Amino acid sequence: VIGDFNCTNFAINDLNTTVISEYVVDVSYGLGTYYILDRVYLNTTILFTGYFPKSGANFRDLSLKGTTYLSTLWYQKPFLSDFNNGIFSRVKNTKLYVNKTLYSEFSTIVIGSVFINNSYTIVVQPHNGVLEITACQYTMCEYPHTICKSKGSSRNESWHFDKSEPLCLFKKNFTYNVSTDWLYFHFYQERGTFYAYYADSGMPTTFLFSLYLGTLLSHYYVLPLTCNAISSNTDNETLQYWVTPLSKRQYLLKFDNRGVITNAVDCS
Ligand SMILES: *[C@@H]1O[C@H](CO)[C@@H](O[C@@H]2O[C@H](CO)[C@@H](O[C@@H]3O[C@H](CO[C@H]4O[C@H](CO)[C@@H](O)[C@H](O)[C@@H]4O)[C@@H](O)[C@H](O[C@H]4O[C@H](CO)[C@@H](O)[C@H](O)[C@@H]4O)[C@@H]3O)[C@H](O)[C@H]2NC(C)=O)[C@H](O)[C@H]1NC(C)=O
Ligand SMILES: CC(=O)N[C@H]1[C@H]([C@H](O)[C@H](O)COC(C)=O)O[C@@](O[C@H](CO)[C@@H](O)[C@@H]2O[C@@](O)(C(=O)O)C[C@H](O)[C@H]2NC(C)=O)(C(=O)O)C[C@@H]1O
Ligand SMILES: *[C@@H]1O[C@H](CO)[C@@H](O[C@@H]2O[C@H](CO)[C@@H](O)[C@H](O)[C@H]2NC(C)=O)[C@H](O)[C@H]1NC(C)=O
Ligand SMILES: *[C@@H]1O[C@H](CO)[C@@H](O)[C@H](O)[C@H]1NC(C)=O
Ligand SMILES: *[C@@H]1O[C@H](CO)[C@@H](O)[C@H](O)[C@H]1NC(C)=O
Ligand SMILES: *[C@@H]1O[C@H](CO)[C@@H](O)[C@H](O)[C@H]1NC(C)=O
Ligand SMILES: *[C@@H]1O[C@H](CO)[C@@H](O)[C@H](O)[C@H]1NC(C)=O
Ligand SMILES: *[C@@H]1O[C@H](CO)[C@@H](O)[C@H](O)[C@H]1NC(C)=O
Ligand SMILES: *[C@@H]1O[C@H](CO)[C@@H](O)[C@H](O)[C@H]1NC(C)=O
């Protein structure tokens, strides 16, 4: 389980519906890199040491789409994952339509340790072009999940159950371009401080925020999303949430004559 609060018992079973899909990391076009601090470099190559993917390691697609039932197996290893230094995410923006109006959906991610309400859990969740980010003492459910707020779902939303507002270290919103096909994120920790970088356009990410926690983060998990759409019998749309572990590595980076990172090489 995630957390330990019994939020609901509606439509739960133990069915093995899944295999973790895999894809190979290739940083040759700047995927997995980030812009360095407040610096700018022009028409040049730099050797830089940072939190980067291993080139030629795998991405895992951790996204899960449900309709009514939730499998208990979705809330265990290999999905519940060790955080270590951090993770890089490549996220498909699942652009849906209702009455020819566009809506953006993708999987919420949570990062934490015990997920009990005596500890801080980070949550990153989209709301159709608003990205909501929080770090609070949430009472996480045993079986957390989200919903398609656009197309609807056969079940109500529940990933935490706090009746009063929980204590929070952080709460902010960031906009993202709902028209783009891919969002990239780095999440990592150093000396008890969490760091987040993202991009919605291009591949190299840029700094969103950092947050002192003091405690080591140990686990992350990508929430199942429940929807009456997003399947081969209604629209052939799909969720994807690819992740791969970060580590301290040396990269060659190439910056063009307008300061964009166009290419990179992992030096091992
Ligand atoms: C921070 O997070 C913790 C969990 O990590 C929360 O603690 C849990 O809080 C809930 C809600 O108060 C507790 O659930 C209630 O426990 C009562 C006692 O359980 C014993 O008795 C029942 C029989 O009544 C046995 O089956 C059980 O094995 C235990 O021996 C129950 O009496 C309550 O049941 C009643 O309410 C539910 C509500 O849905 C009804 O469905 C039932 O029919 C019944 O009317 C209820 O189950 C839970 O025990 C707490 N867990 C722990 C480990 O402490 C904190 O509440 C949370 N803090 C904040 C501020 O939110
Ligand atoms: C994580 C995962 O495996 N995700 C897949 C999902 C699950 O395996 C399934 O939910 C598990 O179920 C458990 C745990 O019991 O199956 C999906 O495909 C279904 C068929 O497998 C889909 O076509 C549904 O078929 C129905 O016959 C039915 O009820 O399953 C009628 C329903 O209206 C229709 N859903 C719609 C309209 O989206 C789905 O979506 O749910 C595609 C998802 O990628
Ligand atoms: C951040 O974005 C969220 C999601 O849009 C905002 O939350 C909504 O706020 C309105 C007005 O208070 C409520 O009616 C809704 O119920 C809220 N939830 C949702 C899911 O829409 C939030 O107000 C924004 N700002 C901050 C500081 O969090
Ligand atoms: C969860 O809560 C419901 C309602 O109280 C109860 O029927 C069910 O047996 C509970 N399950 C567990 C594992 O506590
Ligand atoms: C689920 O099915 C996959 C693919 O067949 C298999 O690799 C895996 O061991 C199964 N897991 C469980 C829990 O049965
Ligand atoms: C970029 O660098 C190359 C190699 O030194 C040079 O040939 C080219 O003229 C430079 N262009 C600009 C606009 O700096
Ligand atoms: C969803 O919420 C509504 C309103 O409280 C309730 O009538 C319905 O039974 C709930 N369904 C589930 C599966 O939680
Ligand atoms: C949003 O994304 C689309 C597709 O990449 C792009 O054409 C458009 O110019 C972007 N708009 C803004 C305001 O970023
Ligand atoms: C999904 O794509 C397949 C292959 O083209 C097709 O057979 C199927 O009818 C499509 N379903 C929908 C809802 O478009």
From Swiss-Prot:
Residues bearing glycans: 6, 16, 43, 99, 117, 156, 173, 177, 236
Cysteine disulfide links: 7-141, 136-168, 148-227
Domain BetaCoV S1-NTD: 1-268
Stated role: Attaches the virion to the cell membrane by interacting with host receptor, initiating the infection.
Protein name: Spike protein S1
Species this chain originates from: Human coronavirus HKU1 (isolate N1)
Gene that encodes the chain: S
Entire-sequence positions represented here: 14 to 283 of 1356
